[PDB]
């Protein structure tokens, strides 16, 4: 047992009867944290006779073999010559007395000849992380690495933001508590904490009350292959891998505090008040100037929404109790928990639809009962009731989706929109197969899909425009009277550019039902535009209220499409690849780009409903 | 390094400078499998200075400390004095040469005084399991234990049936492949295989083509606490646990072969032909003796069914790629995979509804077009179309549920049944709030819930009967003419016994919406019975066809309720508790008790629809 000292390299040879033993003695003072770390190298001509390293402490035995062997799932084998590990630090309890620690390193091998090794044992100068500072380091599949963070006294929540400038190697960031065994191995990290897979970015939101002693270990473990991440192997770090394989991942970790509760309250107030301003405005506009179908739709909506609410409640609970944060595809850099929600901002963000489709229901209902008055006293208002309920249910089902976004959790709100569309077109056509033509398309490529997939999209986007035009030709009360054609070719160019942008899987742009519904809405609004143009072709004066509504529709739809094209996350890929697109909060420290889309689409879709409703007021005199 | 021999106990004392070393030399012949195992005991006055045991082999280092420490999640601590482990066996390759193996056991401790220990090292006489024999053994949290199974050459699938006669300790049964990292620790078993939690029963279905070399390791790992199983701790094995804690789980494992493909084909044929016999019979019966609502319902059904199909497809894929078999609550003892299905029998079992509700649609449609003939040439057939579509969609959504049964995966088919019920009652009442009264109940206690929960059920079951009677009074074309009351009190006793049989642990046994729908159907059929009795109270002759149909309805509903009361699994509990109720296949080596319920309810529910349809033929002359 050599009285060995730190920071000094020891070379050695071990055979079947050598058993080299080093003894490292050190001390640790109350406040500081020591965190000894052990590096051992071998030379890899040991592969059938590895170098067996055993680190003995007062209460722990850490064994490993050097070369480090890894089994890749396609019957592949990797070995690492450099193996490094940090021993569980035990600090002297505050203001009580320093602790004298003694560590033993036994190096053995069962080889008919020698086995070469090199041993270094250091103390980590920067074990502990600071509350707002970036910290740079490297890790490897064989050299995992963890650090300690101590919560301050006036901080009750933090975000661990880990960033790497290169996608591979695929890594794991877990958050263990301070308890001796640290699980820092490929088969250990996913056991006893919260963890996130990571290619380029990761962000874990920790509360203070979830950690006894108000401190934790953040652990970085580099996987041997990139399959949970996508490319299934990647080594540029070391070109010759059997020679010296070092999947060296460079990391920077910053532990940022979180937003105070004042941000919560003032963003909540901002949203609710900026949408009740529509109420307080329409009230003044309307007062200063002085069915069976409906209940069918509500019965359908309630019993479509209930199982989805239960589903996402279960998903959220599972993600809470398990440390697996690869189930929900959040924007982990703007995701604020309130209770169990874990992303409350992009749920509150759907306040738009729920409030504004209901104000639209009030508007249509007032118009309708005033018409009933003027009729029994001496329009397809069911369609507008359907429109309002579809807005409110997009809001509801979108909040349910944004409880936990998955590859199984979407497809519910878009299916409800398809259902409401089909029901409206049945009730429209009865008063006046293309309906099923969309149903056969929205069900065939639901889960179907290069070139053979292209004709699938090119046929899909075309059949959607036809179903939208065949839908609108029935929904325009003056469809034939208005047109009684240069734009008809121009709209075909809009749809032909729409289809040609879909193509082989994507040309550039994913989710089949959602894409075809986007095409549906685009063609519907473009038909509305063509109808406005044909109204202006005649000398029919557009009243000031639909004037403001069409101006606002165009403006709001531009400002909403901008934020529709952000894509801060995607369930299309692995969780670690989704997680590398999300960025910070742009508005009020609380809302990301997708939340400004849930506001501006619920505002732009309400102004378009209003345009379509209150358009033909100039006919109230031309009966 | 003592030349030490097997099966002999060595006592010893180690201190800061002793480092006892034993050397065990043995040999291994080509065919046989050795599987050395190491037992080490300490005396537990070592708790701050454990006994550190290191087992060195030619290619592996197995370290542990003795006392074995365990952290229970509620800040609890357990220690185990006896620690036993089986070393990864490496067999001499067949017919090539025996292998001489050498094992080292280093026993150390850093104690100012002695540390007592005892060491035994044996060879496992029965490491390998046989293809049809039961094998009894014991395991403990500190003495995990695994065995090797080699597939025979004409067996391509097996079921590992593990049984224990006592619920706790909660255990894990995993199936690793033969590679010397064997993951047999609490933080290892769930990493690299298929695994099942287990209290009393577990059954894992392995294919031969999923194991290179056609053999595997089955690993039994006893958890330190029973939380993934329910009771959060349980030790009767050792009353004084800090003294000598031994959560000793007694296990018996049997590796049974599987059913051949002939069973698949003949059970599939049995089902399809026993249901096409209804076609081949009604054809002879009918030939030897010589709407907007509909498409609304189909549009609702398709777009309610699509997202659920996608959801359960995703669940099944997740369970396939992950080894976690605690996601789906199957009957693991009758669960036959075909492709990715993993339980094909209880999906094929839902062939009843899909075939028989569609034959009912054909019957109602023939009746309807013959009525159209006899009318334009010179009943609420929409309700019967709804009935047939509800049967077919119960079949479809039930198969989707039985792809992967969860606590998030039910609630979809029952919500569709509620939706169809509500739509039918709207369309019925319009031609002639209690509808919403059930909607408020079927939504309040959806996720609400002792005594305060009792009045919840007692009010729920009552409000369901009222909604069913208020539904039937509208659906009986001769509701008032027939009754123009002793059974009305007797039916109240049926409902009063129905509601006083809820209100119990939660509700005298699980799911609120499903229970209230069962009450709904019970009251509907009982109203049908009361109506038959009132028809017979008058001198109105019941034709022979409704005669056979009512006899068959009663018989089939008795024979179906018997199997409704089996409960082979339950998502109401943890997976390991579900798994302890499932039993073997009763019919044709392929169908369990729940599959004979999917046959006999789809047969009994069709005969009741037929009774209700063809009942009032004796009025075709009394118009
Ligand atoms: C038939 C009438 C009654 C039937 C009602 C059925 C449809 C009613 C409209 C409500 C549809 C709706 O809510 O849109 C939902 C999606 C939003 O999906 P997500 O990404 O926000 O989850 O919205 C979109 O995906 C829109 C994407 C692009 C739309 C904007 C393009 C229009 C811009 C100007 C035209 C060029
Ligand atoms: C208004 C007409 C249109 C309404 C549409 C719905 C009407 C019924 C059609 C479909 C009914 C149905 O599918 O029952 C589903 C459930 C089965 O659920 P599961 O356990 O099998 O997954 O079945 C049950 O849970 C039934 C439970 C037992 C009830 C039968 C007992 C009757 C015995 C005789 C009287 C005591
Ligand atoms: Zn969204
Ligand atoms: Zn079933």
PDB file of N, CA, C and O in Angstrom, chain A residues 19 48-50 52 56-59 61 63 65 104 110 187-188 191 292 296 300 303-304 307 310-311 315 411-412 419 426 430, chain B residues 19 48-50 52 56-59 61 63 65 104 110 186-188 191 292 296 300 303-304 307 310-311 315 411-412 419 426 430:
ATOM      1  N   UNK A  19      -1.050  -7.483  -7.760  1.00  0.00           N
ATOM      2  CA  UNK A  19      -2.018  -6.801  -6.895  1.00  0.00           C
ATOM      3  C   UNK A  19      -1.429  -5.514  -6.304  1.00  0.00           C
ATOM      4  O   UNK A  19      -1.122  -5.418  -5.116  1.00  0.00           O
ATOM      5  N   UNK A  48      -8.651  -9.631 -23.414  1.00  0.00           N
ATOM      6  CA  UNK A  48      -9.017 -10.865 -22.739  1.00  0.00           C
ATOM      7  C   UNK A  48      -8.475 -10.936 -21.320  1.00  0.00           C
ATOM      8  O   UNK A  48      -8.801 -11.881 -20.596  1.00  0.00           O
ATOM      9  N   UNK A  49      -7.661  -9.965 -20.911  1.00  0.00           N
ATOM     10  CA  UNK A  49      -7.169  -9.855 -19.536  1.00  0.00           C
ATOM     11  C   UNK A  49      -7.184  -8.391 -19.130  1.00  0.00           C
ATOM     12  O   UNK A  49      -6.138  -7.737 -19.059  1.00  0.00           O
ATOM     13  N   UNK A  50      -8.361  -7.843 -18.839  1.00  0.00           N
ATOM     14  CA  UNK A  50      -8.469  -6.417 -18.515  1.00  0.00           C
ATOM     15  C   UNK A  50      -7.693  -6.056 -17.256  1.00  0.00           C
ATOM     16  O   UNK A  50      -7.172  -6.914 -16.548  1.00  0.00           O
ATOM     17  N   UNK A  52      -8.249  -4.801 -13.676  1.00  0.00           N
ATOM     18  CA  UNK A  52      -9.347  -4.718 -12.724  1.00  0.00           C
ATOM     19  C   UNK A  52      -9.013  -3.709 -11.633  1.00  0.00           C
ATOM     20  O   UNK A  52      -8.064  -3.908 -10.870  1.00  0.00           O
ATOM     21  N   UNK A  56     -11.618   1.266  -2.770  1.00  0.00           N
ATOM     22  CA  UNK A  56     -12.208   0.998  -1.473  1.00  0.00           C
ATOM     23  C   UNK A  56     -12.212   2.270  -0.648  1.00  0.00           C
ATOM     24  O   UNK A  56     -11.199   2.967  -0.566  1.00  0.00           O
ATOM     25  N   UNK A  57     -13.349   2.569  -0.051  1.00  0.00           N
ATOM     26  CA  UNK A  57     -13.486   3.663   0.888  1.00  0.00           C
ATOM     27  C   UNK A  57     -13.945   3.087   2.217  1.00  0.00           C
ATOM     28  O   UNK A  57     -13.993   1.874   2.407  1.00  0.00           O
ATOM     29  N   UNK A  58     -14.278   3.970   3.150  1.00  0.00           N
ATOM     30  CA  UNK A  58     -14.765   3.494   4.433  1.00  0.00           C
ATOM     31  C   UNK A  58     -16.106   2.794   4.297  1.00  0.00           C
ATOM     32  O   UNK A  58     -16.402   1.878   5.070  1.00  0.00           O
ATOM     33  N   UNK A  59     -16.929   3.196   3.326  1.00  0.00           N
ATOM     34  CA  UNK A  59     -18.277   2.657   3.226  1.00  0.00           C
ATOM     35  C   UNK A  59     -18.700   2.290   1.809  1.00  0.00           C
ATOM     36  O   UNK A  59     -19.881   2.003   1.597  1.00  0.00           O
ATOM     37  N   UNK A  61     -17.467   0.399  -2.194  1.00  0.00           N
ATOM     38  CA  UNK A  61     -16.525  -0.317  -3.042  1.00  0.00           C
ATOM     39  C   UNK A  61     -16.926  -0.048  -4.476  1.00  0.00           C
ATOM     40  O   UNK A  61     -18.032  -0.410  -4.889  1.00  0.00           O
ATOM     41  N   UNK A  63     -15.908  -0.886  -8.193  1.00  0.00           N
ATOM     42  CA  UNK A  63     -15.101  -1.748  -9.030  1.00  0.00           C
ATOM     43  C   UNK A  63     -15.404  -1.479 -10.488  1.00  0.00           C
ATOM     44  O   UNK A  63     -16.532  -1.145 -10.853  1.00  0.00           O
ATOM     45  N   UNK A  65     -13.513  -2.568 -14.683  1.00  0.00           N
ATOM     46  CA  UNK A  65     -12.454  -3.177 -15.462  1.00  0.00           C
ATOM     47  C   UNK A  65     -11.989  -2.174 -16.497  1.00  0.00           C
ATOM     48  O   UNK A  65     -12.785  -1.373 -16.991  1.00  0.00           O
ATOM     49  N   UNK A 104      -8.355   3.552  -0.867  1.00  0.00           N
ATOM     50  CA  UNK A 104      -7.464   2.514  -1.354  1.00  0.00           C
ATOM     51  C   UNK A 104      -7.788   2.239  -2.808  1.00  0.00           C
ATOM     52  O   UNK A 104      -8.958   2.177  -3.179  1.00  0.00           O
ATOM     53  N   UNK A 110      -5.405 -10.875 -14.140  1.00  0.00           N
ATOM     54  CA  UNK A 110      -5.087 -12.298 -14.212  1.00  0.00           C
ATOM     55  C   UNK A 110      -4.495 -12.538 -15.583  1.00  0.00           C
ATOM     56  O   UNK A 110      -5.171 -13.029 -16.481  1.00  0.00           O
ATOM     57  N   UNK A 187     -26.581   1.887 -17.083  1.00  0.00           N
ATOM     58  CA  UNK A 187     -27.655   1.078 -16.538  1.00  0.00           C
ATOM     59  C   UNK A 187     -28.139   1.569 -15.186  1.00  0.00           C
ATOM     60  O   UNK A 187     -28.799   0.817 -14.476  1.00  0.00           O
ATOM     61  N   UNK A 188     -27.840   2.802 -14.819  1.00  0.00           N
ATOM     62  CA  UNK A 188     -28.161   3.326 -13.502  1.00  0.00           C
ATOM     63  C   UNK A 188     -28.870   4.664 -13.517  1.00  0.00           C
ATOM     64  O   UNK A 188     -29.646   4.939 -12.607  1.00  0.00           O
ATOM     65  N   UNK A 191     -32.826   5.362 -13.070  1.00  0.00           N
ATOM     66  CA  UNK A 191     -33.428   4.602 -11.987  1.00  0.00           C
ATOM     67  C   UNK A 191     -34.036   5.502 -10.914  1.00  0.00           C
ATOM     68  O   UNK A 191     -35.186   5.303 -10.515  1.00  0.00           O
ATOM     69  N   UNK A 292     -82.192  21.654 -32.362  1.00  0.00           N
ATOM     70  CA  UNK A 292     -81.793  20.272 -32.129  1.00  0.00           C
ATOM     71  C   UNK A 292     -80.343  20.060 -32.546  1.00  0.00           C
ATOM     72  O   UNK A 292     -79.599  19.317 -31.895  1.00  0.00           O
ATOM     73  N   UNK A 296     -77.265  18.422 -30.304  1.00  0.00           N
ATOM     74  CA  UNK A 296     -76.518  17.311 -30.873  1.00  0.00           C
ATOM     75  C   UNK A 296     -75.026  17.584 -30.813  1.00  0.00           C
ATOM     76  O   UNK A 296     -74.242  16.733 -30.377  1.00  0.00           O
ATOM     77  N   UNK A 300     -72.117  15.606 -28.658  1.00  0.00           N
ATOM     78  CA  UNK A 300     -70.937  15.039 -29.290  1.00  0.00           C
ATOM     79  C   UNK A 300     -69.664  15.592 -28.678  1.00  0.00           C
ATOM     80  O   UNK A 300     -68.710  14.849 -28.438  1.00  0.00           O
ATOM     81  N   UNK A 303     -68.731  14.324 -24.899  1.00  0.00           N
ATOM     82  CA  UNK A 303     -68.331  12.931 -24.827  1.00  0.00           C
ATOM     83  C   UNK A 303     -67.201  12.593 -25.776  1.00  0.00           C
ATOM     84  O   UNK A 303     -66.705  11.469 -25.741  1.00  0.00           O
ATOM     85  N   UNK A 304     -66.789  13.525 -26.621  1.00  0.00           N
ATOM     86  CA  UNK A 304     -65.487  13.402 -27.251  1.00  0.00           C
ATOM     87  C   UNK A 304     -64.382  13.964 -26.375  1.00  0.00           C
ATOM     88  O   UNK A 304     -63.271  13.431 -26.375  1.00  0.00           O
ATOM     89  N   UNK A 307     -62.980  11.531 -22.515  1.00  0.00           N
ATOM     90  CA  UNK A 307     -61.896  10.547 -22.480  1.00  0.00           C
ATOM     91  C   UNK A 307     -60.535  11.135 -22.777  1.00  0.00           C
ATOM     92  O   UNK A 307     -59.533  10.624 -22.273  1.00  0.00           O
ATOM     93  N   UNK A 310     -59.277  12.609 -19.538  1.00  0.00           N
ATOM     94  CA  UNK A 310     -58.780  11.540 -18.674  1.00  0.00           C
ATOM     95  C   UNK A 310     -57.437  11.005 -19.158  1.00  0.00           C
ATOM     96  O   UNK A 310     -56.529  10.756 -18.356  1.00  0.00           O
ATOM     97  N   UNK A 311     -57.290  10.835 -20.469  1.00  0.00           N
ATOM     98  CA  UNK A 311     -56.041  10.342 -21.029  1.00  0.00           C
ATOM     99  C   UNK A 311     -54.872  11.241 -20.660  1.00  0.00           C
ATOM    100  O   UNK A 311     -53.835  10.770 -20.181  1.00  0.00           O
ATOM    101  N   UNK A 315     -51.415  10.743 -18.448  1.00  0.00           N
ATOM    102  CA  UNK A 315     -50.067  11.002 -18.958  1.00  0.00           C
ATOM    103  C   UNK A 315     -49.292  11.923 -18.025  1.00  0.00           C
ATOM    104  O   UNK A 315     -48.121  11.678 -17.713  1.00  0.00           O
ATOM    105  N   UNK A 411     -53.941  14.312 -32.800  1.00  0.00           N
ATOM    106  CA  UNK A 411     -54.819  13.499 -33.636  1.00  0.00           C
ATOM    107  C   UNK A 411     -56.200  13.471 -33.006  1.00  0.00           C
ATOM    108  O   UNK A 411     -57.120  12.934 -33.615  1.00  0.00           O
ATOM    109  N   UNK A 412     -56.384  14.040 -31.819  1.00  0.00           N
ATOM    110  CA  UNK A 412     -57.692  14.035 -31.183  1.00  0.00           C
ATOM    111  C   UNK A 412     -58.468  15.300 -31.503  1.00  0.00           C
ATOM    112  O   UNK A 412     -59.641  15.238 -31.888  1.00  0.00           O
ATOM    113  N   UNK A 419     -64.725  15.728 -37.683  1.00  0.00           N
ATOM    114  CA  UNK A 419     -66.083  15.305 -37.373  1.00  0.00           C
ATOM    115  C   UNK A 419     -67.059  16.456 -37.518  1.00  0.00           C
ATOM    116  O   UNK A 419     -68.130  16.305 -38.114  1.00  0.00           O
ATOM    117  N   UNK A 426     -72.932  17.469 -44.042  1.00  0.00           N
ATOM    118  CA  UNK A 426     -74.153  16.687 -44.188  1.00  0.00           C
ATOM    119  C   UNK A 426     -75.381  17.574 -44.039  1.00  0.00           C
ATOM    120  O   UNK A 426     -76.270  17.579 -44.899  1.00  0.00           O
ATOM    121  N   UNK A 430     -77.951  18.498 -47.252  1.00  0.00           N
ATOM    122  CA  UNK A 430     -79.321  17.994 -47.263  1.00  0.00           C
ATOM    123  C   UNK A 430     -80.313  19.081 -47.653  1.00  0.00           C
ATOM    124  O   UNK A 430     -81.385  18.775 -48.187  1.00  0.00           O
TER     125      UNK A 430
ATOM    126  N   UNK B  19      -6.857  -7.640   4.604  1.00  0.00           N
ATOM    127  CA  UNK B  19      -7.068  -7.961   3.188  1.00  0.00           C
ATOM    128  C   UNK B  19      -6.940  -9.470   2.933  1.00  0.00           C
ATOM    129  O   UNK B  19      -5.979  -9.954   2.337  1.00  0.00           O
ATOM    130  N   UNK B  48     -20.979   1.171  10.114  1.00  0.00           N
ATOM    131  CA  UNK B  48     -20.114   2.252   9.672  1.00  0.00           C
ATOM    132  C   UNK B  48     -18.786   1.748   9.125  1.00  0.00           C
ATOM    133  O   UNK B  48     -18.001   2.552   8.616  1.00  0.00           O
ATOM    134  N   UNK B  49     -18.522   0.446   9.220  1.00  0.00           N
ATOM    135  CA  UNK B  49     -17.337  -0.177   8.629  1.00  0.00           C
ATOM    136  C   UNK B  49     -17.740  -1.514   8.028  1.00  0.00           C
ATOM    137  O   UNK B  49     -17.447  -2.577   8.583  1.00  0.00           O
ATOM    138  N   UNK B  50     -18.407  -1.497   6.877  1.00  0.00           N
ATOM    139  CA  UNK B  50     -18.899  -2.740   6.273  1.00  0.00           C
ATOM    140  C   UNK B  50     -17.766  -3.686   5.906  1.00  0.00           C
ATOM    141  O   UNK B  50     -16.587  -3.349   5.991  1.00  0.00           O
ATOM    142  N   UNK B  52     -16.096  -5.284   2.846  1.00  0.00           N
ATOM    143  CA  UNK B  52     -16.034  -5.051   1.411  1.00  0.00           C
ATOM    144  C   UNK B  52     -15.555  -6.310   0.700  1.00  0.00           C
ATOM    145  O   UNK B  52     -14.421  -6.749   0.910  1.00  0.00           O
ATOM    146  N   UNK B  56     -12.941 -11.294  -8.154  1.00  0.00           N
ATOM    147  CA  UNK B  56     -12.201 -11.072  -9.382  1.00  0.00           C
ATOM    148  C   UNK B  56     -12.213 -12.342 -10.213  1.00  0.00           C
ATOM    149  O   UNK B  56     -11.947 -13.430  -9.698  1.00  0.00           O
ATOM    150  N   UNK B  57     -12.523 -12.197 -11.485  1.00  0.00           N
ATOM    151  CA  UNK B  57     -12.439 -13.275 -12.447  1.00  0.00           C
ATOM    152  C   UNK B  57     -11.465 -12.858 -13.537  1.00  0.00           C
ATOM    153  O   UNK B  57     -10.788 -11.837 -13.434  1.00  0.00           O
ATOM    154  N   UNK B  58     -11.389 -13.663 -14.589  1.00  0.00           N
ATOM    155  CA  UNK B  58     -10.509 -13.309 -15.688  1.00  0.00           C
ATOM    156  C   UNK B  58     -10.981 -12.053 -16.401  1.00  0.00           C
ATOM    157  O   UNK B  58     -10.159 -11.298 -16.929  1.00  0.00           O
ATOM    158  N   UNK B  59     -12.293 -11.802 -16.425  1.00  0.00           N
ATOM    159  CA  UNK B  59     -12.819 -10.688 -17.202  1.00  0.00           C
ATOM    160  C   UNK B  59     -13.877  -9.866 -16.476  1.00  0.00           C
ATOM    161  O   UNK B  59     -14.513  -9.023 -17.114  1.00  0.00           O
ATOM    162  N   UNK B  61     -15.195  -7.947 -12.515  1.00  0.00           N
ATOM    163  CA  UNK B  61     -14.969  -7.587 -11.122  1.00  0.00           C
ATOM    164  C   UNK B  61     -16.325  -7.318 -10.508  1.00  0.00           C
ATOM    165  O   UNK B  61     -17.032  -6.401 -10.940  1.00  0.00           O
ATOM    166  N   UNK B  63     -18.044  -6.263  -7.118  1.00  0.00           N
ATOM    167  CA  UNK B  63     -17.814  -5.717  -5.797  1.00  0.00           C
ATOM    168  C   UNK B  63     -19.136  -5.488  -5.097  1.00  0.00           C
ATOM    169  O   UNK B  63     -20.143  -5.167  -5.730  1.00  0.00           O
ATOM    170  N   UNK B  65     -20.619  -4.520  -0.713  1.00  0.00           N
ATOM    171  CA  UNK B  65     -20.332  -4.322   0.693  1.00  0.00           C
ATOM    172  C   UNK B  65     -21.294  -5.173   1.498  1.00  0.00           C
ATOM    173  O   UNK B  65     -22.437  -5.381   1.087  1.00  0.00           O
ATOM    174  N   UNK B 104     -10.943 -15.192  -7.599  1.00  0.00           N
ATOM    175  CA  UNK B 104     -10.336 -14.612  -6.415  1.00  0.00           C
ATOM    176  C   UNK B 104     -11.412 -13.907  -5.615  1.00  0.00           C
ATOM    177  O   UNK B 104     -12.262 -13.228  -6.186  1.00  0.00           O
ATOM    178  N   UNK B 110     -12.096  -1.306   6.501  1.00  0.00           N
ATOM    179  CA  UNK B 110     -11.315  -0.220   7.085  1.00  0.00           C
ATOM    180  C   UNK B 110     -11.868   0.009   8.476  1.00  0.00           C
ATOM    181  O   UNK B 110     -12.632   0.942   8.700  1.00  0.00           O
ATOM    182  N   UNK B 186     -31.327  -4.142  -8.060  1.00  0.00           N
ATOM    183  CA  UNK B 186     -32.538  -3.335  -8.088  1.00  0.00           C
ATOM    184  C   UNK B 186     -32.459  -2.241  -9.137  1.00  0.00           C
ATOM    185  O   UNK B 186     -33.476  -1.883  -9.737  1.00  0.00           O
ATOM    186  N   UNK B 187     -31.267  -1.712  -9.381  1.00  0.00           N
ATOM    187  CA  UNK B 187     -31.063  -0.637 -10.334  1.00  0.00           C
ATOM    188  C   UNK B 187     -30.586  -1.126 -11.688  1.00  0.00           C
ATOM    189  O   UNK B 187     -30.075  -0.330 -12.468  1.00  0.00           O
ATOM    190  N   UNK B 188     -30.744  -2.404 -11.989  1.00  0.00           N
ATOM    191  CA  UNK B 188     -30.220  -2.990 -13.210  1.00  0.00           C
ATOM    192  C   UNK B 188     -31.228  -3.802 -13.997  1.00  0.00           C
ATOM    193  O   UNK B 188     -31.116  -3.875 -15.217  1.00  0.00           O
ATOM    194  N   UNK B 191     -33.312  -2.652 -17.263  1.00  0.00           N
ATOM    195  CA  UNK B 191     -32.503  -1.957 -18.249  1.00  0.00           C
ATOM    196  C   UNK B 191     -32.478  -2.677 -19.595  1.00  0.00           C
ATOM    197  O   UNK B 191     -32.706  -2.057 -20.636  1.00  0.00           O
ATOM    198  N   UNK B 292     -80.557  10.651 -43.061  1.00  0.00           N
ATOM    199  CA  UNK B 292     -79.535  11.598 -42.632  1.00  0.00           C
ATOM    200  C   UNK B 292     -78.973  11.194 -41.275  1.00  0.00           C
ATOM    201  O   UNK B 292     -77.772  11.342 -41.020  1.00  0.00           O
ATOM    202  N   UNK B 296     -74.997  10.671 -40.226  1.00  0.00           N
ATOM    203  CA  UNK B 296     -74.491  11.399 -39.072  1.00  0.00           C
ATOM    204  C   UNK B 296     -73.793  10.454 -38.109  1.00  0.00           C
ATOM    205  O   UNK B 296     -72.674  10.723 -37.657  1.00  0.00           O
ATOM    206  N   UNK B 300     -69.808  10.322 -37.049  1.00  0.00           N
ATOM    207  CA  UNK B 300     -69.374  10.394 -35.663  1.00  0.00           C
ATOM    208  C   UNK B 300     -68.529   9.191 -35.286  1.00  0.00           C
ATOM    209  O   UNK B 300     -67.510   9.331 -34.605  1.00  0.00           O
ATOM    210  N   UNK B 303     -64.758   9.016 -36.869  1.00  0.00           N
ATOM    211  CA  UNK B 303     -63.846  10.007 -36.329  1.00  0.00           C
ATOM    212  C   UNK B 303     -63.771   9.979 -34.818  1.00  0.00           C
ATOM    213  O   UNK B 303     -62.959  10.702 -34.243  1.00  0.00           O
ATOM    214  N   UNK B 304     -64.591   9.172 -34.163  1.00  0.00           N
ATOM    215  CA  UNK B 304     -64.298   8.807 -32.788  1.00  0.00           C
ATOM    216  C   UNK B 304     -63.357   7.618 -32.710  1.00  0.00           C
ATOM    217  O   UNK B 304     -62.526   7.555 -31.803  1.00  0.00           O
ATOM    218  N   UNK B 307     -58.739   8.204 -33.760  1.00  0.00           N
ATOM    219  CA  UNK B 307     -57.685   8.534 -32.798  1.00  0.00           C
ATOM    220  C   UNK B 307     -57.458   7.459 -31.759  1.00  0.00           C
ATOM    221  O   UNK B 307     -56.333   7.318 -31.272  1.00  0.00           O
ATOM    222  N   UNK B 310     -55.181   4.901 -33.346  1.00  0.00           N
ATOM    223  CA  UNK B 310     -53.806   5.397 -33.338  1.00  0.00           C
ATOM    224  C   UNK B 310     -53.196   5.333 -31.942  1.00  0.00           C
ATOM    225  O   UNK B 310     -52.032   4.948 -31.777  1.00  0.00           O
ATOM    226  N   UNK B 311     -53.971   5.697 -30.926  1.00  0.00           N
ATOM    227  CA  UNK B 311     -53.484   5.659 -29.555  1.00  0.00           C
ATOM    228  C   UNK B 311     -53.029   4.263 -29.165  1.00  0.00           C
ATOM    229  O   UNK B 311     -51.924   4.078 -28.643  1.00  0.00           O
ATOM    230  N   UNK B 315     -49.408   2.591 -28.073  1.00  0.00           N
ATOM    231  CA  UNK B 315     -49.185   1.852 -26.829  1.00  0.00           C
ATOM    232  C   UNK B 315     -48.546   0.497 -27.101  1.00  0.00           C
ATOM    233  O   UNK B 315     -47.594   0.091 -26.422  1.00  0.00           O
ATOM    234  N   UNK B 411     -62.611   3.852 -21.086  1.00  0.00           N
ATOM    235  CA  UNK B 411     -63.288   5.138 -20.952  1.00  0.00           C
ATOM    236  C   UNK B 411     -63.552   5.670 -22.349  1.00  0.00           C
ATOM    237  O   UNK B 411     -64.217   6.692 -22.481  1.00  0.00           O
ATOM    238  N   UNK B 412     -63.070   5.009 -23.397  1.00  0.00           N
ATOM    239  CA  UNK B 412     -63.301   5.486 -24.753  1.00  0.00           C
ATOM    240  C   UNK B 412     -64.526   4.833 -25.366  1.00  0.00           C
ATOM    241  O   UNK B 412     -65.389   5.517 -25.930  1.00  0.00           O
ATOM    242  N   UNK B 419     -72.407   8.738 -25.785  1.00  0.00           N
ATOM    243  CA  UNK B 419     -72.701   9.667 -26.866  1.00  0.00           C
ATOM    244  C   UNK B 419     -73.856   9.168 -27.715  1.00  0.00           C
ATOM    245  O   UNK B 419     -74.771   9.927 -28.046  1.00  0.00           O
ATOM    246  N   UNK B 426     -82.052  12.467 -27.758  1.00  0.00           N
ATOM    247  CA  UNK B 426     -82.430  13.740 -28.361  1.00  0.00           C
ATOM    248  C   UNK B 426     -83.383  13.520 -29.527  1.00  0.00           C
ATOM    249  O   UNK B 426     -84.465  14.119 -29.586  1.00  0.00           O
ATOM    250  N   UNK B 430     -87.452  14.630 -29.411  1.00  0.00           N
ATOM    251  CA  UNK B 430     -87.941  15.705 -30.269  1.00  0.00           C
ATOM    252  C   UNK B 430     -89.247  15.322 -30.952  1.00  0.00           C
ATOM    253  O   UNK B 430     -90.046  16.201 -31.291  1.00  0.00           O
TER     254      UNK B 430
END
